[PDB]
Symmetry: D2
Subunit: 462 residues, 4 copies
């Protein structure tokens, strides 16, 4: 059930049902940091598939045998399509260049291509991991290329679609709640009116701006390092390889990938991952506020604010009979907190480049992909399992709004804020309504108050 | 307008005649124009340098320093320590990472003030030489870390812990005062089962008690002083016993248990103790965020919020929303909490980036630690005196909110939770009281026996 | 010693006769004693308030404000904006989370200075009333955010970007100057293949160019002003057109493309644009950490380091290690970089903690954003003028380090990597040159043809 | 291959080969945030096993049938021993109280106990998830209890043993290198001498202090919330239950667990997790410095510092023939960066408690366990695969040290620092040695220099 491969350190049993070789087994022995939970994220593996596919096709221009190139392309496609995920056992906590994973990809594509050409697994015949699959490449330019492909795909496939669904659901609710006049709260204190639609329009703008911020952080993610080789010079690669590989990846993905104009900047730093993480960090601040507001507006049902009725997805507590909780708000705010921590991890990695290579690469892409996936998935879940089903408690909203002492703000231009403040202070002290306190105080008539104090008229400038 | 003329190996320098600093300091002001006066080395570091140079001058008498000179250095150093010469320190945090510029600034000011006391000429280095006398047996590499730990320890003992002690005592007083008031608990922000306002406040008391324990637990390695390590930690060109004598002198002058760092390489190459102390203040900030934010929300209204607490009014109300008054001390405290968390990340990045024999992020690290300690201390005093001590319970409102809670039916769980859930769901749907006799699970007399909030405050 | 007497609803207040602030400001100094003078509201916020109140006064003439009063408010506001009245702002960042105390401080100072210009009595609110005239059509809730964005935009355009532009141009000059010098690359800190010192520096140039692009990309939503939202964003008790006219007036006064925020609820309830701008400065800090740290290590020695660069000497050497000179500008820059990263976390925590219609972490958020922008700007100028422009290449040392590198045998990969690895391993073990003819893989003439560093700088 | 269970929302197919029930399947449908990578960490599941075992035994004092109690204890033990890991499919990104996981544990222990008593899976007969397995408990007090048990075990079993191995290996090297005189570097510049043993003693102290800091952060992790129930009052639990459960967990683990003196503090906040994360954050700063120093000291072999020879564990690069890299230093520094980010995630969660319950619990324990595991595993790997095999390049060290211009510091007390500075400046400008420059300058004789400038004599105070 094992074959035998060798490196300069000894012989290695390799499971016969695995496409990886001696370098990968050696790497599993040397980097036992975290369990299977710490394995290189799938999107990086798939991006390596896309990248090696592109390199194999392009390398035909620079002397790669079409028969071999074709088999490498088919094997690479299987990696990209997630058919060979079980042949990647290596953790994030490896070489800072992601060398072990590049070798893992080179070995798996080599042996799968060998199998397709009816060769012997482990023979490197006729497909050699270094001479064919890694031709014109280093880990130094391929791992960054895989990071940017993986990041771009996760943003377009998961993060932005998630935020789009949340935007559309919040906007629907904004329109639905456009007529409902509620009380504003500033410093958590009773303030002047606004519509529940107006409050929700704030959330809509925040999510719209989140998608703008993420798109604004993508242009330099579309720059691929492929062609820089060891130090960015492109030593032992051919003129045009960098441009052709980038164009091939753009064609394969339908995303506007281009070669990095400066390969030194592309290898020595991952400032684009720090930039993208920063956009997701801003998104996390927006989502924390939206989810926390909805949590508190839905609080009660009796001794909270109780302005919103949130959908019940789970049965109530057995220890507090029938009690139901804003559980999607909790999942979203926990994700928001995680993204903020991930961002600091990305920042520390990004700041610690040395000369020609930043060697924090696996850690940086792990945190960026984690944040993008969590934000995308949480946005869908928060939308489908909370936002779309939110109802307004119109009776309660109307009571809380009408009872607010700060409706006397409407009397500011009519009787001055000194007299308005006396009415509010007196009504508060007496447990009285504003109307009767103003009549008893003799600042206006019952008919004047009913003309000057209409919530419907306090929703815009005059 | 009045300037004297000093020289360094780079040229002549105009030095204001009314300043005790010299050529090294003026040169440093020309080379490090990063941030305005707001970015000047914090006063506690300057004062700690005063204490340290005072200790070194006295101790150096054992190692050949003229008592006449030593005495004048001690008097001038004491003036620095007492904050009499703060205007003679114009240098910013954003200087050499060893804090060399500030050490030289201290050496020059003490030198010229001592010269003045001995009737010499300012700028002459006669008879008190900044390097040969004031900096004798020392480097910036061991003195700046010594000043950091002295400054940090004094700020913790004089500002941070006294602030938290006042907050602890005020919260504990309120816990006792509110021990009889039964309110409704909130979990997930939802109506929960009863607890006393005293019980809720006892949580806050424990958090502040544990904050003080955490800060004290982070101090033992702050009491380790680098003084004696000189350039790289070997103690090259310093005398045997100097390290122990200077530490003992600082302990005697401050009444704090300062000792020489057992490993001077660890003391110069890293400031892990500042990262540790920042971490304690970071935990404290999480506790204070929770306490201040809870009190903010419990005080919300006065009508369309929770309105359980009445917070003292310290300012007149808004003119834009007439008479509106806000939990302003809660805002100051929660903004401070957020600042401490950011400061902690700055300290961590500095702490992680030591190179070989010297960490050269020293000024940035102590600035953030002193900022956090000062803000936490001052905010704790202000939050205590201007909010906590004056908090009142809205007993009428609390009683209504608690009695009306559907989750009082939890008391019926051991008596009759399936049936309890039906009562709560029905009462909720009907806008009825837990009347809902109608369901026929108990008599009016049984409900009055089985549902007493007074009995739901403990295990049985 | 000279005091006048003002009143609020809480009592009488002594106000220094030589101060333009009033009862609200003195009350605020009594209630918010958190940090010393170092924690005072940053000057750029005060100046931005000057610009904003100037704009409001002029625009308010359309909505019934007496031109005589309006004119005096405009002159007094201009003095605030020009930094003539900085001593009349004693309030700290750690106040109300809306920045209400500072808005009142601005309203009072402009009121009393305008009163003085019109020959009235200081403290009288006659004929210029702080609330009725200077604060007309406004709340703190929409004015403080407006001041934050004006202050942030001006600091970015006047300090941060000019600083990075100088650094970009200086690095680019050096890139061109060093375009012919072939050095050894380092990956994992290990000896790698050649690149030019110009190529390495072109990396730094791109990083700074992209930093300026990132900051500019983060500005569009900073140009959105909240002015017109008043209390909760509805614009209650303000006039139609006021929001657009005030934004257009600020744009005209500053020459920056300020516009009214399309959604005033988003503008009051959150400061996501400050979190976005802080994020751009956070990325910039990662770029500058790398550039400054690389130059620090490349300049290391002069004998037992890398010693590829000769950094300008700006200070005299150490007296403790005679003549020793250090990369002090690199230390100032990397300490600033670490500070920006911490500041960013403070901004993020504040930004995440909005409640309903108002985020009340406003002063803390703008303090951290302005701190980061100022430090990055000033450090970029200082690092440029006092280090980068004067950097020299040690061509003799660079040439030795590069020619002796075992990884020049990489050039032989396409000619003869198994054989290339044997040559490197043998030369290393023997302390020999790549002589190692002995292995017999090529002739002395073939090696001289196949191994030219000049040919290893590009793809073929 | 499926049985059928019901909740108030519909019928649910439950795989017959799974011990979880309707609440768990419902939770998998409602919380699709991240894949299997985001599943509740195993140590939390195992800690739930220990906790439910303790509760079942103790509950016999308060009316739980011994027959049932015994079966619950056996099933709980299987969870604790990691025999039933595949029956826990729920993610971290659930209810902030960890309610879904508590229910998952209650269901699995219920059905496994039912199976042991020959009952029908899904019947809740005779072992009821709520009435028996969750007896005297809430999620609010059990999830915090599981967090502290999991955290304490990870610290004692993984983190501290890892740091102990690193401490001992660094101390061995300190002793081994005690005679080797190298050049100190301050600001990265050539400084005065110290032994390689002295430099390594710095690292030893940092790791010793790391273990002290972690132990100093444990006392409040040993406080268990069990007994607080819903809000901390202990409503619907029995007097003595809190103390007995804590004592039982202490006995089962051999760790000094005690009941939290204040259950309000224990439910409303997780300040102890923030405290422990802070200790691991300080540890990360220490390990960043140690790993980065060793990386740079091992740099070359020719155009770096080259003072250390690091063990080769992998074959050299094929693109740069024979090039070998400090890969364990990279794994360690990437872990250090991750711990710093995790710490910010923990801090944000810890700061955001509301009234009687902090609902960031799963996110906080995930980050704490991640940091502890990574630090522990990286410490072992860095020790075994780098530190124990480090050699000194004595020839190179001796050259770099003897050539340093700052050996003239030894002449400070003999000829004053002004004359010493002239010698250094002149020798530098002339490319000369200190000795001959001092003779040519005429500040001392060849015999005086050889007496006054001995590196052996510059290693201590005089
Ligand atoms: N990691 C690369 C070499 P590779 O491309 O083999 O990963 C380096 O040493 O710089
Ligand atoms: N900064 C110190 C020496 P000093 O004591 O002069 O500050 C160094 O160069 O290592
Ligand atoms: N702070 C504002 C009002 P102001 O404009 O008085 O600052 C509020 O109470 O919402
Ligand atoms: N989560 C608890 C109830 P449970 O114990 O069922 O998890 C709450 O609502 O406070």
């Amino acid at each position: 059930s094992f074959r035998i491969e060798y490196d300069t350190f000894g012989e290695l049993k390799v499971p016969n049902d695995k496409y990886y070789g001696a370098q990968t087994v050696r790497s599993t022995m040397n980097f036992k940091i975290g369990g299977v939970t710490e394995r290189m994220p799938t999107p990086v593996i798939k991006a390596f598939g896309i990248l090696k596919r592109a390199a194999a096709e392009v390398n035909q221009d620079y002397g790669l045998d079409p028969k071999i190139a074709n088999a490498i392309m088919k094997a690479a496609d299987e990696v990209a399509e997630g058919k060979l995920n079980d042949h990647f056992p290596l953790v994030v906590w490896q070489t800072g260049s992601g060398t072990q994973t590049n070798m893992n990809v080179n070995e798996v594509i080599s042996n799968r291509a060998i199998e397709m050409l009816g060769g012997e697994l482990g023979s490197k015949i006729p497909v050699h991991p270094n001479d064919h699959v890694n031709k014109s490449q280093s880990s130094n330019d391929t791992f960054p290329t895989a990071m940017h492909i993986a990041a771009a795909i996760e943003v377009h496939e998961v993060l932005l679609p998630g935020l789009q669904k949340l935007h559309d659901a919040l906007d629907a609710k904004s329109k639905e709640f456009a007529q409902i006049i509620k009380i504003g709260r500033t410093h958590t204190q009773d303030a002047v009116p606004l519509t529940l639609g107006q409050e929700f329009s704030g959330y809509v703008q925040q999510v719209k701006y989140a998608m703008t911020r993420i798109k604004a952080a993508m242009p330099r993610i579309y720059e691929l390092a492929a062609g820089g080789t060891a130090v960015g010079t492109g030593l032992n690669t051919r003129i045009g390889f960098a441009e052709k590989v980038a164009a091939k990846v753009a064609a394969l993905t339908g995303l506007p990938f281009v070669t990095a104009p400066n390969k030194f900047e592309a290898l020595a730093a991952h400032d684009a991952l720090v930039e993208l993480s920063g956009a997701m960090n801003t998104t996390a601040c927006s989502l924390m506020k939206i989810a926390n507001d909805i949590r508190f507006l839905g609080s009660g049902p009796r001794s909270g604010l109780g302005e919103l009725i949130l959908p019940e997805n789970e049965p109530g507590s057995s220890i507090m009979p029938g009690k139901v909780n804003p559980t999607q708000c909790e999942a979203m705010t926990m994700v928001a907190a995680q993204v903020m921590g991930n961002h600091v991890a990305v920042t520390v990695g990004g700041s610690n480049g040395h000369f020609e290579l930043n060697v924090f690469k696996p850690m940086m892409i792990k945190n960026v992909l984690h944040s993008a996936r969590l934000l995308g998935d949480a946005s869908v879940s928060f939308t489908e399992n909370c936002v779309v089903g939110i109802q307004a408690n119109t009776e309660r909203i109307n009571k809380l709004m009408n009872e607010s002492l700060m409706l006397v703000t409407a009397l500011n231009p009519h009787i001055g804020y000194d007299k308005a403040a006396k009415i509010a202070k007196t009504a508060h002290k007496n447990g009285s309504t504003l109307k009767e306190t103003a009549i008893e105080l003799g600042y206006l008539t019952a008919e004047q108050f009913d003309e000057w104090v209409k919530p419907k008229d306090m929703l815009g400038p005059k």
